[PDB]
Ligand binder design. Sequence first.
Ligand SMILES: C[C@H]1CCC[C@H](Cc2cc3cc(O)cc(O)c3c(=O)o2)C1
Ligand SMILES: C[C@H]1CCC[C@H](Cc2cc3cc(O)cc(O)c3c(=O)o2)C1
Ligand SMILES: N[C@@H](CCCC[NH3+])C(=O)O
Ligand SMILES: N[C@@H](CCCC[NH3+])C(=O)O
Lengths: 499, 500
Amino acid sequence: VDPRLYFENRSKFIQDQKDKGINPYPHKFERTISIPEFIEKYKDLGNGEHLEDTILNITGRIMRVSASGQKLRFFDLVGDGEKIQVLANYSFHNHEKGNFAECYDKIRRGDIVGIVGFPGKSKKGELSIFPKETILLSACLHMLPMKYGLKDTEIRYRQRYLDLLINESSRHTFVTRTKIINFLRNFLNERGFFEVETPMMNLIAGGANARPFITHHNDLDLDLYLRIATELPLKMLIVGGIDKVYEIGKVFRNEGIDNTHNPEFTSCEFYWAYADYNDLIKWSEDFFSQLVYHLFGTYKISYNKDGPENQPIEIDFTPPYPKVSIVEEIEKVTNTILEQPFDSNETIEKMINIIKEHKIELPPPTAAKLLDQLASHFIENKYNDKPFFIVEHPQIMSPLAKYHRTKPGLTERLEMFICGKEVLNAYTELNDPFKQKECFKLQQKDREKAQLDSAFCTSLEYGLPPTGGLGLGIDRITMFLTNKNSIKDVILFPTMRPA
Amino acid sequence: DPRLYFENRSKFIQDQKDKGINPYPHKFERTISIPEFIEKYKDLGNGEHLEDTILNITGRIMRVSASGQKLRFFDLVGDGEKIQVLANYSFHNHEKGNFAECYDKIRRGDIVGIVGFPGKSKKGELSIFPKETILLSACLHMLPMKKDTEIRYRQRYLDLLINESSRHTFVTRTKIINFLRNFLNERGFFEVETPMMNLIAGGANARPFITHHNDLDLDLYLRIATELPLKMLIVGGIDKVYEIGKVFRNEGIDNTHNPEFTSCEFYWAYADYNDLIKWSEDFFSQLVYHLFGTYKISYNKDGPENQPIEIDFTPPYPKVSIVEEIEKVTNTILEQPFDSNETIEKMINIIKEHKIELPPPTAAKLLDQLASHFIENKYNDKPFFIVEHPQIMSPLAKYHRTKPGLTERLEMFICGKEVLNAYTELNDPFKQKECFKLQQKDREKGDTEAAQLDSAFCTSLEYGLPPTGGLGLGIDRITMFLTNKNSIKDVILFPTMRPA
Ligand SMILES: C[C@H]1CCC[C@H](Cc2cc3cc(O)cc(O)c3c(=O)o2)C1
Ligand SMILES: C[C@H]1CCC[C@H](Cc2cc3cc(O)cc(O)c3c(=O)o2)C1
Ligand SMILES: N[C@@H](CCCC[NH3+])C(=O)O
Ligand SMILES: N[C@@H](CCCC[NH3+])C(=O)O
């Protein structure tokens, strides 16, 4: 029909109710029971049975309107993701409260109502509330979309409340997200880790390699950068003696947006004094295996990697997972030998040309950037049926990772991928301040062609114990455990191009 | 000379490297933590050694002393607990190096790993008796003694290492958030995350922070509150929803203001103002007893140099209507409309006559100034509610069902400081835009802290927001009163500060 005319008529209805003295937005309706609790109490009720002496006050949203004549009105009432039917029969209406037809003729799809009624099942077995009075609590002034109208449109992301009301799978996705975070918090808390809050506005944005957001505090007259990671202050806390410390919160990176990149996303980083790379590998295998089984009762799950049209693949989270050394694998699959140093002009041009030969995009072509593109194009999709680790990244890729205790030029680093998407980053922590500043200076010369924080370097000088730290991408993990191809689908309000 | 001392320790590190020793080993497997060590061998007779039991233990050295050529003593601390180290020349593994040369290297602050056996000293001190002591990470600076300055805020790791009280404060902070989360979760509430970057910063009266996303060429405001997206979730059918996280306000800094701080907002469909007062009394009373085993706490409102006072969180708490109480204390009549030039001019004259500082003197700012100077310190021995704020002051609160011009709003104070804000939510879409249109009139007068209108929020209300009660908590300020702190800086690990 005409949505605009429909909204204007509903707006006039609201005003006309006010002119007649009715308040269409009452202050308080005292509910006796919720819709889920009502399904629970009366599901085992007789086919056709009534409990007319049990009077209840319930609320919900009308999501379907139908009629069987003037004296039998049928509705769908939804709440907390669950639904019952409303059977309004003239025979049971409390005529002292008003005229039957004038009450229910007013109801529209979407209206929030409060119902005083009694429980029963229809002749057909359909669990129902039988009102004796229905009261409008909050009207829906627009036409609700069809499920079809939300299918391939971004109304889901710009009007998420419509998606939550119309699509049952939407509520389930975000319930799983909270369950994932709850399980991660308990998993760490049971292991003695201490949750903290580190600043989101900082003089320097470090702990990763990404362009930051900038903002300004007026009263201090200070430019501040939003955190791109929580890594650096969490290590300062380890120096402070919080030997098991973690944080779950937002980080911000001023980068490209796509199906795996939201400018603000949720990370968890934990730091574990006296642990090393081996402890972090075992932690990763323990956590993901127990999380998947906590949620699905099994280690195998299906994931529509190629969209809902193509058939799904199966991801087996049974430990252990394979470990692939980045340099050795690139060397193996390319039939090249990457001599050290990796940032020598010899190895750079060697990586540049094997980039050019395989028709890949040359990144600023730094040795770190080239190695990333090589692993991205030759390793990261090695496994799709199972998560897997890429390990032992070179030092020039890992300015904060401790040097490999036996393999020169490499670090004790790990990255876990699921279907070619990084969800985990961990390594033995670099705690030698002299080796740390040398890593900071090389990035600055790489900059001239993240910033070094003197406060972090100073804290290393008071003694950082041997430590292992780990970071998780919560949204990306939720994607795979909710069968979603876009990060927009697991964030309630994702960052959108403005309308 | 600390600069000389750091220079010597740095040279020691390099010379240790030149000789053949790694001063920062990769891995040492700890057998037992220091808390487990105390808890397991507290039941030891004075002077007994369990020399058959060989343990690997780690910690930070915090004191170094010596008796002769063959005995050396240390404090080893970890996880806020401390044990003694008795390095005796009798038990030293000489195959690893010279006894004196091994322990001469150790300085206060060094992280070490110890292989040794448990025992108590002759005096009764629980101790680890090393057979080998390995340097794991040196402290290259002199560690100060028990740091009572700005150092605590810029070098929090030092404050955590040296001051026992610092660790307990932040432990209590995390305990408070844990209790809050469990409290809401067992009541059926659903935790969510909403955007911290937005086209508009609504939900409160505060100046925002602005930032810019390069690839989209789009200015974005940091959220000043979580009200608006959360209520949109109520529209979406999440009838019990909440969020615990950071918000950002571009304001002045003081003992109760950090530019970023932690808030909890929860929204509860089919509840109202009265359910919210009930929740506040239940939550605060149970929280205080959870932490303390009593509803009464001590707080040094006037600093440690002055006598403390008792705060009784036993419910119920007093309720004070703002306009009526101001009118009573001020002996004037504040007529509606409160934003009329007449009522504004009188409130200004009340502030001038009383030698209080005039605020942009908007009606809402004037009322709040009058409440702060005449109402909010009425009760210090107990928390209390200021209630029934005018429409002008609360553009998102539902109008009072019996009192014209007021709303069904409450804010709870402790020792004059706001820690809670709550009200029956305005859910009439046509009243909300009127409230939005009115606050832009105040924004035209220079009110940088006037809430902007979110058309996406107004649209969501047109799809039907059920009757709802919402509530906000200032987590940091609550932590202050429950850890006996007079500054918000003392309950945030790294408060906002200028560069060194
Ligand atoms: C903290 C990290 C630990 C494990 C690796 C992932 C990597 C990652 C990067 C990223 C960058 C964006 O600009 C936007 C995003 O959404 C993401 C994301 O989701 O994940 C997170
Ligand atoms: C979400 C609110 C609900 C309950 C009332 C407090 C008020 C409050 C405001 C504030 C403003 C700042 O600019 C810095 C801060 O630190 C704070 C703070 O701590 O508390 C929070
Ligand atoms: N800060 C890292 C995560 C932790 C890495 C191990 N310290 C990142 O942004 O990916
Ligand atoms: N947004 C409010 C807290 C919630 C008030 C009740 N909806 C504030 O910043 O104070």
